[PDB]
């Protein structure tokens, strides 16, 4: 019978819903202060409250819209859909939750919107020349990824202001390169030339039409150009039903936020579009550079992926900027830029290899926990993402939507979207904590029999000065009677120490450093476990000593994050794929790996005993990766057969193994083939 809300929610219809999901409370005098109150739905139900007066809301998980996920990107008419649920209805009760899932597919043939944003500094004059064959060739290779690709073009030359520009010391730098027997263009900040078009042959011509300018300050204006290309949808030509690839091509270090101080540029960058009718950034002389923060939010919010087509000697800065600009990718550009075709095709494939979700406009009282299905039916907790996917593959995320306490009676929209995808899941969230009979109440002084009090949920409720079992014993003094069940098992405390029994309910006289809740003064707001001198380290609230964690925290001490970037490796894999994540850290895997992400494994067998497993399946149809149907995504290495394992003279590991057929196979494992892993497997293994 008497379970939790028996002492914690009896004083208030809202409180009994706030206290536990199992509680119900009858009305219309079904049980007119009969004896039990609140308890469990089932106890009141049996004790004459079976009729729907019980005011027992439940939580719900419903889907409002589920347009089916699409197989092919060119499958227009009905909008090509990248995710399964579209609109979700979520109904919560306090301290409760519901599960849902997000199916995301790397839809095959999905259209590509690519913009080529070029460095127009003088060192690139030969680049503009080489690029005369691109657009046509780029799109041609991309025809394999998708049948529909559009190509645009723009450029940057840095802010046309005193310290960046050659200052126009004389007139001679108004139209520069007078210095070296040639001519070149003035500085312009950021320019837009060609919007994205399907007529990609226009790019070939538009790039031939361009020529370079002069920069005194080596750092590039590339960050204003990226941000404007990212933000100015209306001119860039980005269509929402397409991937947006912003290609940034450059031979130099970029200039960043507040460096602009040198030119008297102190205006904050609001991340807005400032490109006018002349297809020119008019803010180039007044606004500062965008920050890594602004770039990240705008490219994430608007689904733009950045590709850094950067020459080799500056890659260290671009790679480090991408770490601080999540979702972007950085490759290595040839000095003649002939490899932008390949750089982009691989960059696209890399972008599409990751599925990552981000939740927009998530309120403070709700916690969204994720378990991501990265392979087969195995899910890894604490993940917003999965690595190692191919185009046409799916990822399945399991989400738990939990609410702390009782947030305000407003409907909120939680947008759950893959990053880079237009499609998203809108979860419409409401909180059912209000007993209908809370509202259908007219206290009116009288009505609490003969007295002055309130009334709710079918029974009277006299407040302070009137109290009593119904309406009696205003200020104790009539108190020395009635006994009552003031404590479990009648152990005879007056009231669990901090309080005193008063006419059927206890009154807590304490009013120091917090609050006391419940009929028996049961709940001590201030009594819980400390983590580091503070109850649950300040990362949750307490209710009767039970800490209710805040967003992204778990555990009795609210000391464990649900955050994994602190345990994530440089290769994008949690625990480098060999270890388990716990409390923001990493648990050591049996072979002896160690460090925050299991980086080092000195007593670990050489790679040859781990790489043979890939060959054994991708080429020979044997091994764990065969049985587990995993090799195809696990091994992303290139494996080729050769007639001879030659004296390469480079970093090639000589690997060997005896197979099921009593044959000996040798192969070489070669590192860094322009960043790729290459295996050379002998065509003719030895055998008896």
């Amino acid at each position, epitope marked *: 019978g008497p379970n939790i809300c028996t002492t914690r929610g009896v004083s208030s219809c809202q409180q009994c819903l706030a206290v536990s999901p199992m509680c119900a409370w009858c009305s219309d005098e079904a049980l007119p202060l009969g004896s039990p109150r609140c308890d469990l739905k089932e106890n009141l139900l049996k004790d004459n409250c079976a009729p729907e007066s019980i005011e027992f809301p439940v939580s719900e998980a419903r889907v409002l819209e589920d347009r089916p996920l699409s197989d092919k990107g060119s499958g227009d008419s009905s909008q090509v859909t990248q995710v399964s649920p579209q609109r979700i209805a979520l109904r919560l009760r306090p301290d409760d939750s519901k599960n849902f899932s997000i199916q995301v597919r790397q839809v095959e043939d999905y259209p590509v919107d690519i913009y080529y944003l070029m460095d127009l500094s003088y060192s690139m004059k030969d680049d503009l020349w080489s690029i005369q064959n691109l657009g046509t060739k780029l799109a041609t290779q991309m025809r394999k990824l998708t049948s529909n690709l559009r190509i645009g073009f723009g450029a940057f030359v840095d802010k046309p202001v005193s310290p960046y520009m050659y200052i126009s010391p*004389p007139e001679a730098l*108004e*139209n520069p390169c007078y210095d070296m*027997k040639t001519t070149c263009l003035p500085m312009f900040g950021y320019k837009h030339v060609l919007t994205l078009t399907d007529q990609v042959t226009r790019f070939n011509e538009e790039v031939k039409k361009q020529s370079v300018s002069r920069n005194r300050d080596a750092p590039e204006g590339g960050f204003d150009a990226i941000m404007q290309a990212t933000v100015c949808d209306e001119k860039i030509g980005w269509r929402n039903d397409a991937s947006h690839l912003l290609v940034f091509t450059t031979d130099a270090k970029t200039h960043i936020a507040l460096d602009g101080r040198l030119a008297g540029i102190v205006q904050p960058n609001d991340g807005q579009c400032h490109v006018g009718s002349d297809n020119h950034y008019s803010a180039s002389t007044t606004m500062d550079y965008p920050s890594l923060g602004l770039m990240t939010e705008k490219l994430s919010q608007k689904n733009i992926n950045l590709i850094f087509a950067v020459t080799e000697n500056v890659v260290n800065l671009y790679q480090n900027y991408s770490e601080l600009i999540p979702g972007t990718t950085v490759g290595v550009l040839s000095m003649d830029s002939s490899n932008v075709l390949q750089l982009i095709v691989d960059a696209y494939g890399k972008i599409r290899s990751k599925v990552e979700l981000e939740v927009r406009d998530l309120p403070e009282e709700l916690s969204l926990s994720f378990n991501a299905t990265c392979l087969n039916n195995e899910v890894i907790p604490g993940l917003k993402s999965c690595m190692g996917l191919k185009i046409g593959d799916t990822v399945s995320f399991s989400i738990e939507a939990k609410v702390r306490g009782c947030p305000q009676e407003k409907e909120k929209s939680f947008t759950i979207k893959p990053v880079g995808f237009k499609d998203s899941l809108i979860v419409q969230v409401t909180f059912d904590c209000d007993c209908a009979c809370q509202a259908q109440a007219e206290p009116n002084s009288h009505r609490c029999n003969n007295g002055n009090g309130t009334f709710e949920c079918g029974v009277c409720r006299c407040g302070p000065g009137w109290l009593g079992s119904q309406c009696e014993c205003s200020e104790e003094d009539y108190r020395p009677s009635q006994q009552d069940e003031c404590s479990p098992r009648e152990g005879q405390p007056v009231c669990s120490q901090r309080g005193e029994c008063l006419c059927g309910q206890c009154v807590c006289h304490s009013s120091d450093f917090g609050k006391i809740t419940g009929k028996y003064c049961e709940c001590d707001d201030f009594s819980c476990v400390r983590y580091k001198g503070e109850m649950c380290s300040g990362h949750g609230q307490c209710s009767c000593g039970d800490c209710l964690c805040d967003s992204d925290w778990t555990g009795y001490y609210c000391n464990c994050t649900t955050r994994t970037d602190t345990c994530m490796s440089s290769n994008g894999l949690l625990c480098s794929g060999r270890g388990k994540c716990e409390c923001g850290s990493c648990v050591c895997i049996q072979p002896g790996s160690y460090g925050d992400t299991c980086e080092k494994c000195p007593t670990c067998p050489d790679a040859c005993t781990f790489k043979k497993e890939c060959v054994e399946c991708k080429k020979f149809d044997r091994g764990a990766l065969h049985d587990e149907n995993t090799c195809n995504r696990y091994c992303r290495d290139e494996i080729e057969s050769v007639k001879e394992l030659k004296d390469t003279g480079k970093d090639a590991v000589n690997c060997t193994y005896k197979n099921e057929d009593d044959c000996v196979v040798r192969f070489q494992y070669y590192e860094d083939s322009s960043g790729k892993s290459i295996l050379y497997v002998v065509e003719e293994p030895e055998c008896p």
Partner: antibody
Amino acid sequence: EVQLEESGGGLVKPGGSLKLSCAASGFAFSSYDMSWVRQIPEKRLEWVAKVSSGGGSTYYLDTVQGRFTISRDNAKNTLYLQMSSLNSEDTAMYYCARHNYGSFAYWGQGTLVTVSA
Amino acid sequence: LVMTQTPATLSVTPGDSVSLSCRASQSISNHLHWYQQKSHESPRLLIKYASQSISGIPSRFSGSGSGTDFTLSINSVETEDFGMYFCQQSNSWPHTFGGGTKLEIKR
């Protein structure tokens, strides 16, 4: 104070060749671009050729190119103009000049070149 | 590029003010200079880069203009202002000069 002195002008038979010199002192010769400007009998000024401060870049009037060479010796503080395949149109007072970012800030006194049979 | 310079000749009584005009066929930003040439003497920079005067050149000489149209004004012409004037363009190869204006003093 900047001092520019050109020499080597004179009467040259058409189709001939002639070398002009221009000595310089009073300034860091190798820190500035040098030009030759000629004044044609109509009193019109015409830029002829430019040599960069380090001598790396050399620009010529299109109707001069392939016949004239502008060069300098930064150690000898002397500017040169070697003319060849001379026509009557090349008759003029030749002035060497020092640049100030596109302007000819300082000028020589002039060396007269007569092209005639 | 063609630099048109007018007027070709000018007769100015001392104390009177004059101006010369330079026209370029295309835009030359501010890459226009002015020179003076007195008898049996070489040309001298007067104004560089359309309005920047030089160091021992009188304030009476003031250049102005941008792109395609430039002026050189001389307030209160003095006897010693006699002689030829030339504009020169330093925008695009080859460098070009205007035809030149012959300034004469009225007496």
